[PDB]
Amino acid sequence: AMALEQALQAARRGDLDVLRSLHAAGLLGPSLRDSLDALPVHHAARSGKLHCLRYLVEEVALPAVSRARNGATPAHDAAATGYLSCLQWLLTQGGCRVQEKDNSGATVLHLAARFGHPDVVKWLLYQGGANSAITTDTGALPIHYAAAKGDLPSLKLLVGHYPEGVNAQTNNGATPLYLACQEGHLEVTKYLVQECSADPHLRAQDGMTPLHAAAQMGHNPVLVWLVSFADVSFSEQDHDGATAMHFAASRGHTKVLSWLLLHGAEISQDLWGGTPLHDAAENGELECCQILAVNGAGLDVRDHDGYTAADLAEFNGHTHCSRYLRTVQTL
Template sequence: MAALLQASAYSGDAYNIREILERGKVRPDAADSELTTPLMLASAAGHLDCVKLLVEFGAYINARRSTGTSSLFLAAQGGHLEVVRFLFDVGALIDSQSNNGATSLFIASQMGHMEVVRYLCSKGANINLCLHDKTTPIFVASQNGHDAIVRQLVSSGADVNCRREDGTSPLWIACQMGHVVVVQTLLDLGAESDKPRNDDGVTPLFKAASKGYRTITNCLLKRKANLGLQKSGYSPLHAAAYFGHLSVVQLMLENGANADLKDKDGLTAAQLSAKRGFDSISRIISLQQNTVY
């Protein structure tokens, strides 16, 4: 009977839920082996009528699965705004965290559910709660290209220059993923263009250059991003040359990249690109060199 209640909650069968619960033989919080309750299943599927019915019969609103996720979290994950509203109104804990630290605001930001994010922010959700590795809602919104959510989070007080434990910033991850609009938004909102990752000192410009993202590279160069050698021993020009990104190489040279810089192995970008078989790139860089080899 408990399995039937769970199946009815997930499928949205309010009639069956009422019939089962009125018999009084199954608790409304009857959970499976992972502590998933009928209310969680109805919330995850967006069945508002079933959610209301289960609460009417006494379902515990703030129960948590073995992963630490709640009904509110699952509703936010699915983008079910009306379910999120109802659960909050009847006492759902807005800042409840899963085992890895994720909140309802975090998962809505990750999934791109703008209306849910706006609602949770309006109700005072803590925008600074993060995963154990310090990944924040603005970080995952930037990572997934959700520009409107990035703007909403910043307007609610999110730190545009927050960093994960490894030093990666929202701008850094947006550059890696190639989200041009988010990159421009973050820069406009005050993101530091040269904030490096901790372990290797790689900057947003270096990452964009290595990926061949010309438009993002141009955005960063307009903010005077550093074209010099990085902690890794390579410059952004070396990165673009190594991966054969001709248009990015040309753009950086036009913006003053030093073609004579040598990497940690003593190679210029021209020599490195030649070694990689990108002869046309090597010739273009060589024309900008002052040193003759």
């Protein structure tokens, strides 16, 4: 266990002399792995220590294509961490193939996009030969990852390289735009809608629109822009009848909730009879309860189980919300 910690630490630090000493003592080998099955080659590559990576592959003979528990090679580590020098060496001298996949089906191009490394994305596309049309086992393209990260330079590169990806949906139905809205990336959202003809009406498999995702995750700047400039309705419902307001109230996003109410969004029941006040009360979101109650939410509306919002707060132990709601009802 001591040789292991010394080897991994030296590989991350670039301490080539320690690796040489361990190699001389016969203490480096392909079974010397951490708890995720990563070798010293992974730890050098994820740390940008190219001289140690080369020593471990060229001299110690640790395989450049070795795989961690999830199938990641040292090239996957390097692409995810942005260490282009290590990635380039592995893909040329090291013998890694640019299309090698981890267990999920992700390539180094997916991972460079996922973690927002546009220098790596650019080199992979225009020198490394990486394929931009490859889906993982969830249906994800590199463009999905770039959009979710909010990496506009990588996204521009990937749209130019594979423009058919713009409106592609993952297996659960998400478009790059859905993901950009979910993650609150306004400039990427604008680019997709304004410059790439991204369709903001393509829904995920559960009926959620990109606007629902922005409200669910509290990204008011994205929600405001979609409603105000992209012709997205804040009244649309998912497969359960939920509106943007339900999602915002359920997760305490008072700014989204306020903006929706300010601009005339209605306080409506979903297919289960719950209003956004039910969602806020059930989850102990006191400030959302107050905003809804002051702006005309029906305090006495019962869901399909016959429960008012105050009842739901009480059954979930949210006594601050139930006490507030029951006193307001008396007025």
